[PDB]
Symmetry: D2
Subunit: 256 residues, 4 copies
């Protein structure tokens, strides 16, 4: 591909799931890609699989990991054009009274501050390249979700932060956007479903929450990321919904 040829992209949590889909999309568009992940298994295999992708072990909650990720990217490829902040986690369903402040802090540390820290360290290089930032948020930041107060809160923060940063970085020509996926079939979706009393029913329900009648694919999020990086040159501070229409209309959720 040539849509993003000559560009260098860092994808956090790129070892599996949505992140791996985004990695593949950017490789297919001609970019060189750095796969950041805290686990080795998926990302190492992906590096072997994909010419133009390399793997760097990095836990985005560890500031020295992230500093090394940025400096290794520059040392090896000489520029940085796009950072995709995809690393994140959805805890199992938890009733509000079953949550804790400390668990909330830990989830904020990954879903929000990990995105903040890489963005901050990358911005000097993105400014030189007139590059861009893509944050992977969630539809449920906008519309809410049951049994997920901490998670919903972290994604509300990511989406809002995206707009703040877009404002700050617009004078430098650096665009900052986010993608808000809905149900995307990933290993995390599979893991969460396996915890439920009836996994198969949870998966059917998840497929049917969308007017389109299926969950989304990592490749579909990847395509949206490539669009934001390579062609959305008048888009900054937007929230691109990749949800199959889940937010549309009424569903199951006289006046007394």
């Amino acid at each position: 591909g040539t849509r993003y040829a000559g560009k260098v992209v860092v994808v956090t949590g790129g070892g599996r799931g949505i992140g791996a889909g985004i990695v593949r999309a950017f490789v297919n568009s001609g970019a060189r890609v750095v796969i950041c992940d805290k686990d080795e298994s998926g990302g190492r295999a992906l590096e072997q699989e994909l010419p133009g992708a390399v793997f760097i072990l990095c836990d985005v909650t560890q500031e020295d990991d992230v500093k090394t990720l940025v400096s290794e990217t520059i040392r090896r490829f000489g520029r940085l054009d796009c950072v995709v902040n995809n690393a994140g986690h959805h805890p199992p369903p938890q009733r509000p009274e079953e949550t804790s402040a400390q668990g909330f802090r830990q989830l904020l540390e990954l879903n929000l501050l990990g995105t903040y820290t890489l963005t901050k360290l990358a911005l000097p290089y993105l400014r030189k390249s007139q590059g861009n930032v893509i944050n992977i948020s969630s539809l449920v930041g906008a519309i809410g979700q049951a049994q997920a107060v901490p998670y919903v809160a972290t994604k509300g923060a990511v989406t809002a932060m995206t707009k703040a940063l877009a404002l700050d970085e617009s004078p430098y020509g650096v665009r900052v956007n986010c993608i808000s996926p809905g149900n995307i079939w990933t290993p995390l979706w599979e893991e969460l479903a396996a915890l439920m009393p009836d996994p198969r029913a949870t998966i059917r329900e998840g497929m049917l929450a969308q007017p389109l009648g299926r969950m989304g694919q990592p490749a579909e999020v990847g395509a949206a990321a490539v669009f934001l990086a390579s062609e959305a040159n008048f888009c900054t501070g937007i929230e691109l919904l990749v949800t199959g229409g889940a937010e549309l209309g009424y569903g199951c959720k006289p006046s007394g």
Copy 2:
């Protein structure tokens, strides 16, 4: 009541349903209320029932009816402080291919242009009184609805128009706001349900579309209108949702 004492309010479609609830709320707050409706039966009874409410027969799609409504209101009460554009209609469910341009035009004529025409004729008086406009839109203007392309379109227009007009009238101190109800139990809701194969099931489904587990009441929309008129003095161009949370979260509406 004294929250809106000494004020004069016009409520279109005030003979039944949401409009009658709004009429009652304003009377209870101390205002004098003009009940506008194209049908006599409900509004005439309401005038007899409520001291401080009077009924004026007026079809908001007929410009001379509306001109007379405004001039009779001023002749009888000497001022005009609030116009509530509630008159409107939801056609039966219709698939897109079952709609027509002419039916769409007719629905626009009521739901949108009727609101426009009264607002336009009232604004000289609202400017003198630093009064305000309240448009009754719908949640489905924001989130969509199935088998209702014309209706959804008219309410998307009302909500957007509310913001445009708020901008234009802000220099004059005239606030313009809208209320977007969700399922409110009214005669129109009952009529629509009676068309369905199973009315009781349609009503149960409608009650359950809300996290709160019931439909809303006309009095609850009425209370929101009184708030916007009497106490929301720093609110203009807002969309106040009165929906029981229907827009929140996923509902019923693997990656292949």
Copy 3:
């Protein structure tokens, strides 16, 4: 290009401005494009310029023009994969009291019902092809604009209609999306500015309404349309903002 190779696209108002940018984007992506426009001058030249684009004279407010547009497209190319409803108009600034119901109706006829009519006639063919609809709305439908009550209302309607139709057509695999541009430098923008007391100042103000410090280009809207057609396969009922960030933050628009 090959992103949308073998596909057939109809672009209304494709003779100049945003529509011509969209035409060019789709041609560059490998599609065959039908340029619909009520004026001959731009579209005829564009047909001569672009292999793979042809021009059909058609006024989208004339139902028989639109019926012929669809049947000629099928007769000449054998399928229809995407309809881009771009034709529309922004009247000069008008204070609310300077508007009329009949001017409002005429603007609704173009900006809203023209989009409705082509969509309706195209949908049988889009269903066979699992094609998609792209409506060109406006940011000001969402956030409002001064001295433009009718225009704002028409675009609020288009955006809402997009969501309604997405719901109705999702069972058939037909996606329905809209693009909401902000200030895009087009002949209409130039014409409107030329009416102002100071055209150059109006244009400078328009450039600065965006954090990015410039207006957008037709090609940038075109790229977003190609993305929605060719790669956004899990997107339906979305509003894709192409605005340069104009909706972000505070601007020029103690407690007494």
Copy 4:
């Protein structure tokens, strides 16, 4: 007043500014009010001033302070009907590169986790009383703000959390809503302005960011809170904008 007679309300950060306005609104509506604040000066005076208001020293970032606040409220008044999470802080303008992860964490601790902790400890009592939660968020959580990445992020989180919690608590009849003010003239606004090179200009600019041409008052936020507590019985998970229209239209913030 009698709108909220017999009810017990806790207002955090009630010693001055918006919180004190909310305290006064609830007292005027007939409620008994607990003023929570980390500083004694304003709240102690307010307790002396207002029959029906009492002051409890409490730092919402200190879990044992908050536990004692709830148990003292129940011991002294026998019930709890509404919690208003108003305590929060806006740091001085800070460019993204001038922020730190640790400052971000500290701001999250106040603006987000303080709201979480009181809500969590109050919910058993709110469930018994079918009470409600009101969170004071900010417009800039929704639209962004320049030189305020941490602040914007915290308020995006509060607004999203409000919707999540509304979903979780709806089966228990507990409503959870938020108010998103824009520029409200408060001591914090005055303090921030005094840091600027030209305070008077910053204040003029702040007044003019609103179509209404002034900043809002604490009493106006207070009225909106009383409405949400006492009359918005079909509202849950909403974001009530109290902004003077700042989010409407274009402002100051050719295609090359």
